[PDB]
Every structure is written in structure tokens, then in C-alpha cells.
């Protein structure tokens, strides 16, 4: 005997379709990817990233689609419900999904592993997007490193970290929709040249235009607060307004925040929240949605969905 009870295997090293249907499979089933696949991912997926600008511009010609999702928190067994509602992807089915893929939940690894397969599998047409939790500061509370040093090693929680650093911050669909996870900025005049200027590969500052892409939320009235989460700030309708002129767009999408009924309308349809996180810790009962955009008319069509039974594994379980 040698590996032939280890599961699914990589093709020469390489990501295959039949390889993810065998991981999202086997992961069903609550069990481990073989250590040396879950490497041969992330360091593949690394240099993929770590080619992206910190905005990733995308083109949707006229008749082609895309979903996009919000936080998903390790809660694997939705992840999979996402895909059986929605289809797996692929080039023609693309998927952005925006921030938050860890930590609370605790199949943490079994999202970020699944997602960074699609990612491989199809990086055109597959978007990752860092949200506030892929940062080790998170991480280190609320379950992830917990967790990876729980099913591997300390060591692969470092590569996981490395491989955090090199996710885009932001993601424009055809110079129209601004995706980001967390939302704009804590002072006007912001562009998209400056998302592009950012130098991602770190952990975010305290405050300034990374942090406020990963951490910011709306307020109903117009200005500016201090964040009641003590990091980053609250914006109104007129700074979501003021940045969508200055820079030619026609709104954003962002996570971040649950509610109830899976997404919310804000600043005049200005700013759209989705949060694909149902039934969020086990406990919040909220729905959870995703969004589909065309090419050819950017307005966003929410679909709701509700949680799916998962193995008897507690929230944070593995958290401090
Ligand atoms: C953390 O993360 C929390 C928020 C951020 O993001 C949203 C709402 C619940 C959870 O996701
Ligand atoms: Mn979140
Ligand atoms: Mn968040």
C-alpha cells in the first residue's frame, strides 16, 4: 500500500474538472485533501494572483453572464448548495466571489480549497476578491489558522497567508459595476487609478484605501462616520454618488454586512450588498443571495437560498 486510499489526485500536478467533482465529492464526504495537492494548489494559485492587478478588469460582451456571491464563511455545504442552484462553473457559468470565503465557519478550508481549484481550473472566468477575514489578524481569532493547523500544519497557514496577500482588492465589470468586499473610501476624490496604484502583497494598513476596500460600510445619510467596528468609516449616499461620477460607473457590489433577506438596496440602488452566508453561524436564520449580471444590462437579478444541512461540526469551532 502506498497512496491509494488518499483521494483525489492532481493530473500531472494540474487542476482538471474531473479533479474538483472528485474534491467537492470527497469534501462531502468530510474528508482531507491530500497535503501535497493542497500545496501544489496554493503555490500554484499564487503566481496566478500575484500576476493580477490589485484591480482586475473584466469584459462581458453582450450576451455573456456572471454571478457573483458574498461571504461564505466556510460554510461548505452552501458553497456546494450555490453550485447545484446556480451550476458548477466554468467559461461559460463565471462566478466572482467577494471576500470572506473563511473563518466563523469551520469547513474553512474546505471553501478555500475548492475555490482556489475553480480558480486554476478557470482563472478567466473564476474571481476571487480579498475580503477583511483573508488577513492573518482574523484569522488568527476567528477559526481559520485554528483550523488549518487542526487538519495540516502551521506551516501550511503560512502559505495560506502568503496566498491572501496576492488577492485583487476590486473588480469592474465592463468600466460599469465596482465590485470590492467591504466599500469606498474614507475621503473623496478617490479614482480607479488609485486601486491599481495599491500595493497589495501585505496586511492592510490601519487606515487608507486597502483598508477601507476590505472594511468600509454604507450609512443611509449622506457623509461620512466613524465605523462603529473601530476600523475604517461609514459613507453616505453622496460619497457612493461622488465616486460613481468621478469615475464613470454605474454602481457597486459589495459584502460584508448579513441581512436578513440575503442582499440590500441602498443609496438609490447606488450600493448593492449581497451576502451569501444563509442561516449565517448557525444561528442568524438570515436568507442568502447571489447576484446575475449581463453583459449586455449590468442591473443585478438576486436569487435567494436558504441553509443546507452540514455535518455536526459547531461554528468557531476552532476558533481562540
Ligand atoms: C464577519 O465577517 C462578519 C461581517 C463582515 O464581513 C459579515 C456579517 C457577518 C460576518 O460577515
Ligand atoms: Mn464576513
Ligand atoms: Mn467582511
Not at 457573483?68 to 456546494?80: E, I, R
Not at 501550511?156 to 465592463?174: D, H, K, R, T
Not at 449616499?237 to 460607473?249: G, H, I, Q, Y
Amino acid at each position: 500500500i502506498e497512496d491509494e486510499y488518499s483521494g483525489p489526485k492532481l493530473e500531472d500536478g494540474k487542476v482538471t474538472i474531473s479533479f474538483m467533482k472528485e474534491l467537492m465529492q470527497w469534501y462531502k464526504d468530510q474528508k482531507k485533501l491530500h497535503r501535497k495537492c493542497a500545496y501544489q494548489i496554493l503555490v500554484q494559485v499564487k503566481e496566478v494572483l500575484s500576476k493580477l492587478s490589485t484591480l482586475v478588469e473584466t469584459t462581458l460582451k453582450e450576451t455573456e453572464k456572471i454571478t457573483v456571491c458574498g461571504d461564505t464563511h466556510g460554510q461548505f455545504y452552501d458553497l456546494l448548495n450555490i453550485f447545484e442552484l446556480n451550476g458548477l462553473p466554468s467559461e461559460t457559468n463565471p462566478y466572482i466571489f467577494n471576500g470572506d470565503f473563511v473563518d466563523r465557519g469551520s469547513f474553512s478550508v474546505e471553501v478555500i480549497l475548492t475555490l482556489f481549484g475553480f480558480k486554476l481550473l478557470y482563472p478567466d472566468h473564476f474571481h476571487l476578491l480579498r475580503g477583511n477575514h483573508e488577513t492573518d489578524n482574523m484569522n488568527q481569532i476567528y477559526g481559520f489558522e485554528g483550523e488549518v493547523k487542526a487538519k495540516y500544519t502551521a506551516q501550511m497557514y503560512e502559505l495560506f497567508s502568503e496566498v491572501f496577500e496576492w488577492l485583487p482588492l476590486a473588480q469592474c465589470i465592463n468600466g460599469k459595476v465596482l465590485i470590492m468586499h467591504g466599500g469606498l473610501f474614507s475621503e473623496d476624490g478617490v479614482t480607479l487609478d488609485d486601486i491599481r496604484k495599491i500595493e497589495r502583497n501585505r496586511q492592510p494598513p490601519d487606515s487608507g484605501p486597502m483598508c477601507d476596500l476590505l472594511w468600509s460600510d454604507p450609512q443611509p445619510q449622506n457623509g461620512r462616520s466613524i465605523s462603529k467596528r473601530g476600523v475604517s468609516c461609514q459613507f453616505g449616499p453622496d460619497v457612493t454618488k461622488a465616486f460613481l461620477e468621478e469615475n464613470n460607473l454605474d454602481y457597486i457590489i459589495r459584502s460584508h454586512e448579513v441581512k436578513a433577506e440575503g442582499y440590500e438596496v441602498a443609496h438609490g440602488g447606488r450600493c448593492v450588498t449581497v451576502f451569501s452566508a444563509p442561516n449565517y453561524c448557525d444561528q442568524m436564520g438570515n436568507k442568502a443571495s447571489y447576484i446575475h449580471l449581463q453583459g449586455s444590462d449590468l442591473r443585478p437579478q438576486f436569487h435567494q437560498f436558504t441553509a443546507v444541512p452540514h455535518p455536526n461540526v459547531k461554528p468557531m469551532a476552532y476558533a481562540n
